[PDB]
């Protein structure tokens, strides 16, 4: 299947600041003929279910602030948190749905330092 | 003076992953001149000296692996360090030599994870 590698694994934030999350798919998931990178993130707040954030590696889910910029293409990939906030703290996963079975990371967990 | 923010200002990564430190000066560090940033990144070891290892903001030491790796231009720097190792183990500050005093950031404490 093919294997996503979230890095780092957890991180302490100060607020205001930017949060830098990476993640990596074993295979490339993008798709030739349309050029869309088949790549989620999901942000997963404190006993809370995991919600989808951004999809096709940069497209944001309607609600969902500008400060969070999903980037990369093929094999890379970067969520970006600007100004974090209170309400940021969450373990944020990635998802490859390019090919089933759709793998998820192991998670980034972000906490306010 | 100019100040200097890190973020994050920790994080856990696991071996042969990819650790990212972002750090940014309040004015910009970039001599018109000869196009150079003023910006240096040190590594701080548990127990020891703060050791030099990238300046000019790209420029590695000697004996610096290529594995560390200093970007940015301006006011936005990033240092890079891939292929995560246990003697990576550190905390790791930016620095902006552009104008007295020149400040340091608070640092980025990595550890293992």
Same mark, same amino acid.
């Given at each position: 299947?093919?294997?996503?590698?979230?890095?780092?694994?957890?991180?302490?934030?100060?607020?205001?600041?930017?949060?830098?999350?990476?993640?990596?798919?074993?295979?490339?998931?993008? @798709?030739?003929?349309?050029?869309?990178? @088949?790549?989620?993130?999901?942000?997963?707040?404190?006993?809370?279910?995991?919600?989808?954030?951004? @999809?096709?590696?940069?497209?944001?889910?309607?609600?969902?602030?500008?400060?969070?910029?999903?980037?990369?293409?093929?094999?890379?990939?970067?969520?970006?948190?600007?100004?974090?906030?209170?309400?940021?703290?969450?373990? @944020?996963?990635?998802?490859?749905?390019?090919?089933?079975?759709?793998?998820?990371?192991?998670?980034?967990?972000?906490?306010?330092?």
């Amino acid at each position: 299947d093919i294997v996503m590698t979230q890095s780092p694994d957890s991180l302490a934030v100060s607020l205001g600041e930017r949060a830098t999350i990476n993640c990596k798919s074993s295979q490339s998931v993008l @798709y030739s003929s349309n050029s869309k990178n @088949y790549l989620a993130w999901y942000q997963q707040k404190p006993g809370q279910p995991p919600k989808l954030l951004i @999809y096709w590696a940069s497209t944001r889910e309607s609600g969902v602030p500008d400060r969070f910029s999903g980037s990369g293409s093929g094999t890379d990939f970067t969520l970006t948190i600007s100004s974090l906030q209170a309400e940021d703290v969450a373990v @944020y996963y990635c998802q490859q749905y390019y090919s089933t079975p759709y793998s998820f990371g192991q998670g980034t967990k972000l906490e306010i330092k």
